[PDB]
Amino acid sequence: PSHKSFRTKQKLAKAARQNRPIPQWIRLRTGNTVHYNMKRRHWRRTKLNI
Amino acid sequence: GRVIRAQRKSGGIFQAHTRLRKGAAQLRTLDFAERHGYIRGVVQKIIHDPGRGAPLAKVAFRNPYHYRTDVETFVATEGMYTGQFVYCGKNAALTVGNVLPVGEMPEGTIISNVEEKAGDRGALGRSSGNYVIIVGHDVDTGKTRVKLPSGAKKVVPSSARGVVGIVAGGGRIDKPLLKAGRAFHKYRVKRNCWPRTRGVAMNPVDHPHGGGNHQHVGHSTTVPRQSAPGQKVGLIAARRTGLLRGAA
Amino acid sequence: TKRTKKVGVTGKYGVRYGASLRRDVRKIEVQQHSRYQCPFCGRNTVKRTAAGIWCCNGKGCKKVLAGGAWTVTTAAATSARSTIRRLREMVEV
Amino acid sequence: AQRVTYRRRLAYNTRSNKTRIIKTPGNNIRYLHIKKLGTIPRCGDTGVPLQGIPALRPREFARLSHNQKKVQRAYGGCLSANAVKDRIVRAFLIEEQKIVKQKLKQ
Amino acid sequence: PRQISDIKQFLEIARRKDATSARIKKNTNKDVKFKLRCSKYLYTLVVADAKKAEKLRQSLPPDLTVTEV
Amino acid sequence: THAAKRLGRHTGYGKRKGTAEARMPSTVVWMRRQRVLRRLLRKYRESGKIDKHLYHTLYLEAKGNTFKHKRALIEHIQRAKAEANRTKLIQEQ
RNA sequence: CAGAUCUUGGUGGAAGUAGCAAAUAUUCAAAUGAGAACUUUGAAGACUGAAGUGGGGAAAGGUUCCAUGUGAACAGCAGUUGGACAUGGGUUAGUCGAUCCUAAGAGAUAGGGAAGCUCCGUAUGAAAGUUGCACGAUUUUUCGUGCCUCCUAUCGAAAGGGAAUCCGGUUAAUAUUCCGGAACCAGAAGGUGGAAUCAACACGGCAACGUAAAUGAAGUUGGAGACGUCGGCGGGAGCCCUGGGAAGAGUUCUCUUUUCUUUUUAACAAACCAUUGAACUACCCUGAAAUCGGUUUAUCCGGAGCUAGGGUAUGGUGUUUGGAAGAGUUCAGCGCCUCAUGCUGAAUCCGGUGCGCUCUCGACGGCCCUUGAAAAUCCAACGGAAGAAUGGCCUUGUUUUCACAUCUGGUCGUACUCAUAACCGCAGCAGGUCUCCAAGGUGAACAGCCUCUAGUUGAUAGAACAAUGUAGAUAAGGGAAGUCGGCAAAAUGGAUCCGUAACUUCGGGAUAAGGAUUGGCUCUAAGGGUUGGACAACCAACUUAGAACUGGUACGGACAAGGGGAAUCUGACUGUCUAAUUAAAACAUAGCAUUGCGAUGGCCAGAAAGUGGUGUUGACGCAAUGUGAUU
Ligand SMILES: [Zn+2]
């Protein structure tokens, strides 16, 4: 609400960083089948729950 | 069944509302000055205590042992005016507003804020318009018989203190409340006991009087004295019941 | 104009609460909202505040009196004052 | 006409959210948050406000000079002139009464 | 901002060490404002006479930095 | 339209939606009338046309709604002054 | 395995079917593009109509904010577009909050219970200790002791209390934070300087009291913080309205010296402050008042000292200035690839008004068996601890509660939505979610209706009006004959003037019932404010009443907006409940009555407790019941 604690802001920063597209080279690694990921979170679909 | 409202009144929600109250109305600590002579204080404030029908008197006293002024919270007697002098002790004059030992007062005197025991700092006759009458004295094993507002006779040690006069506030119960709002405002600053729902208007799970196709108690409302909580409702240990026309 | 045959101050209550209750309240409020004389200043300026406190204004005698619910002095208190005065005189003499 | 908004994140009309309309040198009508009004010190014996002392918040009195917070008199800035005079007369008369009481005792 | 009306007081406050810069402002009503930038306050003197303004400028400390806006 | 209303147009019974009190309070009208009457009474008293006693009587009468307007008050003052002068000249002999 | 309304998964007929219809509404042209009903631009027509579809916030969300690209999936139609996808960027504080304090409360510690998880308990039955002086010390200074005295854990509010910032400009996205200018607060140390001292720590006023300073340790006291609600009155700021001048724009068959936009002065600082607007508001001096006087819209004041005269204080959202025109705004020219966007010109002026709106202040009045927080912190007083110049002249102690000057002010939040798409409801759901500002006209009005600023034109579209529907209307004659039942609809409705019954608790009923009028135009009369030699030249105001004339015999012309009356049953009334079938005669209520209890107590609680509530209480009280106004 624009009035957030330091812990809340750090958690939001962590959530934002864990939302980026996956680089393709890691998926192309031999023996690595990361490929597509359903871990992607949208602000309007799945809430963080603090 | 279910726990009744009487059992639920053990605290919590049903605690007294004491935010706006100005302090306890204890007389004073029985010290050497009050035990051997008197001490003169000056009343400086007369204030209204919410939840109490009688005004309270803020009275300033000089500390005998320290350079300091002590303020008390006397229960104001009728005729008390700010700036007057009150005297507390054995040798105090028999004047309205003065605090004297009960045993040092003449028989038949009218007092207020009387102590049940020495040093109790006021127990009897504290409500507005109420007072205690000194019935008699008994020097041998010094005890004073007094008459309480309820009409009972109580024996107290002949060293308990009392305030000469009648508690201020007059007869407050002589005016009809006339409105549920007036009753609501009266009890709001006292506690959560209003309004009250009748037991016969309840269900059997709620009250012993609840249930039935008609609103009726079903059994006698006079219950024995040694009733368990939850069934001690109605008229507890009623010696008599009904309208009485003439008795002592 | 008279504006009221008998209700007087209780005209604010309309027709509710009953005639006897309105009459009793009318007497009480007439006593309650009355200017009284300061026993130390001699001016008819004593007014009630919060059911037992009576104060009079002016440059002097700003005393606050502990009185009755709606009268400065009650009959019972006056009788008690006379009784205490009598007892004090007997003890002194 | 121009309509204004609160300049702070307090969105309620509380006693600490007093605002005044100002016209800036840009033809802009906007709010200006202001503090509560000060209070003149009151007499300790009668409760009347004390003459010659400004009305300020409690912390604002620390920045004033000494003579602006008092009156050049005994009990100045704590009691009114009438209260001081009454105390002086009452003190002198009662001390005289004590002296005559002792002399009459002797 | 503070306003001065005494020529000698303005000269003294100009000769004071904290006085750093002076500004000359000419208005359409034939008035000249001398504004001294001190550490805490900006001091303004208003002069209505150009004859007096010229002598004030001459008597001002030449070591002081004075600019015209 | 405002000019026409100032001249006295569009002010009929069919153009009024609020009550007379709502359109113009009688309390405000009485306040203005009392202030006008008291101002005139003070002006006359400080000018010397009337004395303190006549001023006090007229002040109480104005508070009692004796005079409908300034003209009525002036006529009442003129009659009172004429009678007072008549008594003063009669008592000379 | 064929079943178990079997389990998991996949897939059918229904079926290209139901449907994608609330919230007035879109149209033309151009650009882009392969593709345009949905993108952008322009024009037109509209809506929200200031209690908004506007501008901001609290909670909640967390990057949705901005720029550049994309149109695989979502945007139940589409898409060149998006709160979608991808890549980067974006939140700058001594002054805004948190942080500090305390409220309801939470909760350690001592101690006591409990097998124990843990419970009670917060100066409690605790050896519960931080503040104040110099005893010693080279010498002009916080450490070792000397006897102290009711100190005390902490957490708990982004709406309570509180030290301090404004203006203009700037970005694609940040502004009381950045830039420019101009200020303020707190803390730390300590260069002047006048005052006074050849001896003590200033003067003035008959007073209220005033000043550029004008020594002050403990201890104590007082004040501020610090407080309800309603009603009227007066003042100020902003807005609204209005008369001129100036600049620009609109209309111009005709008329309109016309219509529309701008004409601005922040924090802070100084001097006045009843003048120019507003107390006799408080207090003081002279004087002593009945033939009592003064005085408010409102009835209060005076031998406890009126009226009157003269003073003192309270002092800004008031006045004159600085800030500050150098800013901003409007208009008009020159460079013309113009570059760091440069340069040259003007105006920004003089007046008025108010039962007007919002906010605020001042003096008042009413109400309470309701009297409407605490603490941190700051100030003042009583009191006198302590101090050392003297060769009549250099030299030091106070004055840094005078003025000026130096340094420092850490950490966390700051983007954006705040909702018919950024929160919750499975969703871009007609639901729900606290609050700030509120223009003009009509009108009593924050009603309804139209309009200005601002915003939007977003709710899949096209064609045609079949039955039956949903919503809105009308209808000759009859007028409830319909139906269980006047269900529904109609009818009445604003304002002014007449008139108003039974009954009644005398207060009501009552807007009872029942009648008349209402437009426009031209006038008349009355009700108020400074004013030149009892007169009186204008300016600036809204009402009320009446008359004539006139038209569709019409006029609260849209909107807005009581149907009324006669009886019975029941509940006295206001109020409350079965969220999502029952709002009632049910519950509650004041009133009335009964019962218990004087503290070693009544009632309630707890496993126990050196345990809790009533109880900051004391029979005019607490607790437990029944009935339900008044008579
Ligand atoms: Zn008195």
Curated annotation (Swiss-Prot), chain B:
The keyword Nucleus applies. InterPro entries: NA-bd_OB-fold, Rib_uL2_dom2, Ribosomal_uL2, Ribosomal_uL2_C, Ribosomal_uL2_CS, Ribosomal_uL2_dom3, Ribosomal_uL2_RNA-bd_dom, Translation_prot_SH3-like_sf. The keyword Metal-binding does not apply. GO terms for cellular component: cytosol; cytosolic large ribosomal subunit; nucleus. It is found in: Cytoplasm; Nucleus. Keywords: Cytoplasm, Nucleus, Ribonucleoprotein, Ribosomal protein, RNA-binding, rRNA-binding. Pfam families: Ribosomal_L2, Ribosomal_L2_C. GO terms for biological process: cytoplasmic translation. One of its GO terms (molecular function) is RNA binding. There are 3 genes for uL2 in S.pombe. Component of the ribosome, a large ribonucleoprotein complex responsible for the synthesis of proteins in the cell. The small ribosomal subunit (SSU) binds messenger RNAs (mRNAs) and translates the encoded message by selecting cognate aminoacyl-transfer RNA (tRNA) molecules. The large subunit (LSU) contains the ribosomal catalytic site termed the peptidyl transferase center (PTC), which catalyzes the formation of peptide bonds, thereby polymerizing the amino acids delivered by tRNAs into a polypeptide chain. PANTHER family: LARGE RIBOSOMAL SUBUNIT PROTEIN UL2, RIBOSOMAL PROTEIN L2. Belongs to the universal ribosomal protein uL2 family. This is Large ribosomal subunit protein uL2C.
From Swiss-Prot, chain D:
The keyword Ribonucleoprotein applies. It holds the Pfam family Ribosomal_L34e. The modification Phosphotyrosine is found at residue 75. Keywords: Cytoplasm, Nucleus, Phosphoprotein, Ribonucleoprotein, Ribosomal protein. One of its GO terms (molecular function) is structural constituent of ribosome. It comes from the Eukaryota. The keyword Ribosomal protein applies. Its main location: cytoplasm. GO terms for cellular component: cytosol; cytosolic large ribosomal subunit; nucleolus; preribosome. It is found in: Cytoplasm; Nucleus, Nucleolus. GO terms for biological process: cytoplasmic translation; ribosome biogenesis. Component of the large ribosomal subunit (LSU). Mature yeast ribosomes consist of a small (40S) and a large (60S) subunit. The 40S small subunit contains 1 molecule of ribosomal RNA (18S rRNA) and at least 33 different proteins. The large 60S subunit contains 3 rRNA molecules (25S, 5.8S and 5S rRNA) and at least 46 different proteins. Component of the ribosome, a large ribonucleoprotein complex responsible for the synthesis of proteins in the cell. The small ribosomal subunit (SSU) binds messenger RNAs (mRNAs) and translates the encoded message by selecting cognate aminoacyl-transfer RNA (tRNA) molecules. The large subunit (LSU) contains the ribosomal catalytic site termed the peptidyl transferase center (PTC), which catalyzes the formation of peptide bonds, thereby polymerizing the amino acids delivered by tRNAs into a polypeptide chain. Belongs to the eukaryotic ribosomal protein eL34 family. There are 2 genes for eL34 in S.pombe.
From Swiss-Prot, chain E:
This is Large ribosomal subunit protein eL38A. The keyword Ribosomal protein applies. PANTHER family: 60S RIBOSOMAL PROTEIN L38, LARGE RIBOSOMAL SUBUNIT PROTEIN EL38. GO terms for molecular function: structural constituent of ribosome. GO terms for biological process: cytoplasmic translation; protein-RNA complex assembly. Component of the large ribosomal subunit (LSU). Mature yeast ribosomes consist of a small (40S) and a large (60S) subunit. The 40S small subunit contains 1 molecule of ribosomal RNA (18S rRNA) and at least 33 different proteins. The large 60S subunit contains 3 rRNA molecules (25S, 5.8S and 5S rRNA) and at least 46 different proteins. There are 2 genes for eL38 in S.pombe. Component of the ribosome, a large ribonucleoprotein complex responsible for the synthesis of proteins in the cell. The small ribosomal subunit (SSU) binds messenger RNAs (mRNAs) and translates the encoded message by selecting cognate aminoacyl-transfer RNA (tRNA) molecules. The large subunit (LSU) contains the ribosomal catalytic site termed the peptidyl transferase center (PTC), which catalyzes the formation of peptide bonds, thereby polymerizing the amino acids delivered by tRNAs into a polypeptide chain. One of its GO terms (cellular component) is cytosolic large ribosomal subunit. InterPro entries: Ribosomal_eL38, Ribosomal_eL38_sf. It comes from Schizosaccharomyces pombe (strain 972 / ATCC 24843) (Fission yeast). It holds the Pfam family Ribosomal_L38e. The keyword Ribonucleoprotein applies. It comes from the Eukaryota. It is found in: Cytoplasm.
Curated annotation (Swiss-Prot), chain F:
It is found in: Cytoplasm. Transmembrane segments: none annotated. It comes from the Eukaryota. Component of the ribosome, a large ribonucleoprotein complex responsible for the synthesis of proteins in the cell. The small ribosomal subunit (SSU) binds messenger RNAs (mRNAs) and translates the encoded message by selecting cognate aminoacyl-transfer RNA (tRNA) molecules. The large subunit (LSU) contains the ribosomal catalytic site termed the peptidyl transferase center (PTC), which catalyzes the formation of peptide bonds, thereby polymerizing the amino acids delivered by tRNAs into a polypeptide chain. Component of the large ribosomal subunit (LSU). Mature yeast ribosomes consist of a small (40S) and a large (60S) subunit. The 40S small subunit contains 1 molecule of ribosomal RNA (18S rRNA) and at least 33 different proteins. The large 60S subunit contains 3 rRNA molecules (25S, 5.8S and 5S rRNA) and at least 46 different proteins. eL19 lies in close proximity to the binding site for eukaryotic initiation factor eIF4G. There are 2 genes for eL19 in S.pombe. Belongs to the eukaryotic ribosomal protein eL19 family. This is Large ribosomal subunit protein eL19B. It comes from Schizosaccharomyces pombe (strain 972 / ATCC 24843) (Fission yeast). The lineage of its organism: Eukaryota, Fungi, Dikarya, Ascomycota, Taphrinomycotina.
